[PDB]
Structure formats: C-alpha cells, structure tokens
Design a protein around this ligand. Sequence first.
Ligand code: CLR
Ligand code: CLR
Ligand code: CLR
Ligand code: JQ9
Ligand code: OLA
Ligand code: OLA
Ligand code: NA
Length: 386
Amino acid sequence: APPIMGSSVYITVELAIAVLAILGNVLVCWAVWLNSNLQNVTNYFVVSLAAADILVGVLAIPFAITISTGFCAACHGCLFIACFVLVLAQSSIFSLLAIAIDRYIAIAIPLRYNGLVTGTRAAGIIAICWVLSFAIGLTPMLGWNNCGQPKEGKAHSQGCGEGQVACLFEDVVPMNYMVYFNFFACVLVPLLLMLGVYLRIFAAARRQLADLEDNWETLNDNLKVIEKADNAAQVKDALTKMRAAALDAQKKDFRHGFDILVGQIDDALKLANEGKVKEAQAAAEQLKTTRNAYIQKYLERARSTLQKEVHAAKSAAIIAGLFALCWLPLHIINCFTFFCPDCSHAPLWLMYLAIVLSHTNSVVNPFIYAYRIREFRQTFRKIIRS
Ligand SMILES: CC(C)CCC[C@@H](C)[C@H]1CC[C@H]2[C@@H]3CC=C4C[C@@H](O)CC[C@]4(C)[C@H]3CC[C@]12C
Ligand SMILES: CC(C)CCC[C@@H](C)[C@H]1CC[C@H]2[C@@H]3CC=C4C[C@@H](O)CC[C@]4(C)[C@H]3CC[C@]12C
Ligand SMILES: CC(C)CCC[C@@H](C)[C@H]1CC[C@H]2[C@@H]3CC=C4C[C@@H](O)CC[C@]4(C)[C@H]3CC[C@]12C
Ligand SMILES: CCn1c(=O)c2c(nc(/C=C/c3ccc(OC)c(OC)c3)n2C)n(CC)c1=O
Ligand SMILES: CCCCCCCC/C=C/CCCCCCCC(=O)O
Ligand SMILES: CCCCCCCC/C=C\CCCCCCCC(=O)O
Ligand code: NA
C-alpha cells in the first residue's frame, strides 16, 4: 500500500498527542505559577518535567514526523533531529530521580529538609541536569554516529545530493549507543535507582508508623502496670520507662502537652522513690487526662502527616512507573534489533506504535496530578472555569 496512507495515520496520531501534551503541561506550569500552595521544591522538578513534555509536543514530535519521511539531509543535521528527543527523555529521568530523592529526604530527615532542600539549590540542580541532558542526548553528535558510513545506495535512490543521507533514525544513530549507553546506562540504571529510593521511602514510612503505634501502646501498657503494681519499685520501673519514651517522642499545644506529660511523670516518680505507692499511682492516673487531651491529638496528626507522605510518594512513583511503561517497549525493540541480528526487524507498524506510546508519556502526568493531588485538581478547575 502507498506509504503515505500508513504515514498519514502515524502523523495524525502524533499531532493529536502533541496537542494534548502541550495543553496539559502548560496547565501544570500555569497552576504552579498561580498557586502559592504549589510553589515548593518538589514542584519545581514537576515544572521541569512539564517543560520537557511541552517540548516533546513542540519539537520532538515534529522532529519524529520529519525523520519518518527519510528526507534528504546533511547527516549531522539529521542526527540533531534524531537525538533531540533523547535530551528531553534524559531531562525527564533526572527530574523523576530528583522528585524521588526529595521525597526521601522529606520522610527520612524532615527536621533538616527545609534547610537542606531550598528553591535556589533546586533551580541550580535543574540547570545542571538540563546541561547534562544535552550532553548525554547529543553524544552521537560528538562522533558516536553512523555519518562516517552513509548508506549511499539509499541516498542515490532518493536523489539526495552530495554529502546527504536519507534521514532515518536507525541509519544515523548507532544501536550500540541506543542500547548500552542510552538504555542500560542512562535509563535503566536511573530507573532502578528510583525503584530503590521508593522502596526506602515506603519502608521508612512503614517503620515510622509502626513506631508511633508502639509508643502509644507502650504508654498505655505501662499505665496498666502502674495501676496493678503492688510496690513502689514496680511503679518506679514503669515510670522510668515512660519518661524515656516521652522525651523520645518530644524530639505549642503539643509542647505544652509533652511538658505536662513529663512533669506528671516526674511528680509520680518522686512519690514512687519515696515509697508512696498509692500516692504515686494516683499521680500516674493524672496522665490519662494529658494523654486524652494532648498526646492522642499529636499521634493522630503525626499519623495523618505520614499517611499524606505515603500518598504523595505513591503519586510520584506512579509517574515514574508510567514513564517506564511508555518507554520500555521502544527500548526493548532496540534490544531485539541490536542483540538478535538473526531475528527479522520489528515491523514498521510496531515501530510506529512504540514511538507513539513513548510520546503518550508526555500526555499522562497532568492527569495523574488531577486525579491524585487535590491542590492541583482544584487549581486546574479554577483555571478552566475562569
Ligand atoms: C528555538 C527553536 C524553536 C529552534 C528550532 C530550530 C530547528 C527546527 C532547526 C535547528 C537545526 C536545524 C537542522 C540543521 C541542519 C539540517 C540539515 C539540512 O540538510 C536539512 C535540515 C536540517 C535537518 C535542519 C532542520 C531544522 C533544524 C532542526
Ligand atoms: C510491560 C511492557 C514494558 C512489555 C512490552 C514488551 C514488548 C515490547 C515485546 C514483547 C514481545 C516482543 C516481540 C517478540 C518477537 C519479535 C520478533 C522479532 O523478529 C523482532 C522483535 C519482536 C517483534 C519483539 C518486539 C518486542 C516485543 C513486542
Ligand atoms: C524491565 C527491566 C528489568 C529491563 C528490561 C529487560 C530487558 C533489558 C530484557 C527483557 C527481555 C530481553 C530480550 C529477550 C530476548 C532476546 C532475544 C535474544 O536473541 C537476544 C537478547 C534479547 C533481545 C533480550 C535482550 C534483553 C531484554 C530486552
Ligand atoms: C527513543 C528514541 N527513538 C528510537 O529509539 C527510535 C525512533 N525511531 C526509531 C525507528 C524508526 C524506524 C525504523 C525502521 C523504519 O523503516 C524500516 C522506519 O521508517 C520510518 C522507522 N527508533 C529505533 N525514535 C523516533 C524518532 C525515537 O525517538
Ligand atoms: C557526557 C556526560 C559527562 C559529563 C561530565 C562533566 C562533569 C560535570 C560536572 C558536574 C557539575 C556538578 C556541580 C558543578 C557546579 C558547582 C556547584 C557550586 O558552585 O556550588
Ligand atoms: C502542535 C504540533 C505542531 C506541529 C507544527 C509543524 C507541523 C508539521 C510537522 C513537521 C513537518 C515535517 C515536514 C516533513 C519533512 C519534509 C518531507 C520531505 O521532504 O520528504
Ligand atoms: Na517526559
């Protein structure tokens, strides 16, 4: 069948994806610019990622349409339009890795997050990552390319001029670059590191939630021990364990609560050490008002904050996983092309499906934000309504 027919379908689909990638990610960037509740370091990387996806629509997809035609071009110009999308993917990888690391710092050392992770340092990291993304993605332009070995029979059949090639991705970009350097080193390894970071995030959250419930149970158990103690020494033992746990949980109304709690434990220990069991047990009962009025409120808020961090880390992990799902088919096909020269090449229709799927990744993030992050969803609604 005439190539222009299957080309027409591929090109129309690419153009539809480009429209949606631009619209959704412009909306992401507008939301962050407009809403101060969205202006945090994590979202500066979200914006960097949306900018990469805007440029997939504006540049990488027009470039992909162009290179599907095999038009006559100087080999190094052809290289640039072949490789620019690799810059954007690499930038996306760096942004996704930064987001994972940011959430890990927030869950593992929240007390030093704000002093360690600042907007100016984030903006510098983003600049560096964009520079490194150009260096990685345009590495074929530094000489790791097939321009030294042009397919002259294909160029002559297409009437190309002297020094020109039929501009085709696999004719100019070496597959050993695409497989070993781009895929294994620059994509797979960072995705695997991301997986490791998310595992550490969820394990740290699970451990901290378990510790909250353990400290609550230890407090209530030790209250029972005091209630059913039969000498002053048993009361002393349980209170000493209560006091060390209270200080461990201490590091306004909350600090007031902990101040009362530790003070009331000290009151009871003083009576216990004087051998006044009944007086110490009555003093320790006072702890129950402090537990009800203050400590339980601190516990629920800490649990709620941890649960919100788990939810936000799950949202970020979904984004990273969808990047992997959308890009892996094309990379896997490249592995078959490279490692199995006895295998027939994947058919053209499948090449174009895998390319289109990789571009679809630039559409999906605005939807994940809308469905999973209330502050985004509400700002989107306000932008759209107005
Ligand atoms: C600021 C942004 C929008 C600038 C976009 C510039 C783009 C479209 C330019 C920059 C470099 C250009 C390429 C440089 C060299 C060649 C080789 C020539 O034989 C055919 C065209 C081709 C392949 C050009 C295509 C257009 C091109 C990719
Ligand atoms: C979960 C997602 C990431 C997995 C996607 C796996 C896809 C990309 C795999 C599964 C089966 C694979 C195909 C199996 C058989 C062949 C025939 C061979 O002559 C060319 C490669 C080709 C055509 C493979 C291309 C890659 C392929 C289509
Ligand atoms: C998902 C994570 C672990 C990375 C993706 C796994 C990749 C690297 C694996 C998945 C299946 C693998 C392919 C399965 C079958 C073949 C055909 C064989 O003649 C050459 C190797 C080749 C082409 C493999 C290359 C590596 C491969 C593409
Ligand atoms: C991930 C980076 N990458 C790629 O890795 C990639 C690719 N296009 C091809 C392959 C295109 C293709 C293969 C064979 C063809 O004809 C036999 C063909 O004709 C249009 C296109 N590959 C391998 N593109 C799209 C521009 C791409 O972005
Ligand atoms: C092709 C990829 C290989 C690139 C290797 C080049 C090395 C680039 C070095 C990384 C820059 C890291 C930080 C440099 C800026 C200094 C920050 C500061 O002033 O505090
Ligand atoms: C929102 C997406 C907007 C896209 C703007 C540009 C639309 C057309 C895309 C690229 C056109 C590619 C031209 C084809 C190359 C020449 C064909 C040939 O010489 O054989
Ligand atoms: Na992306």
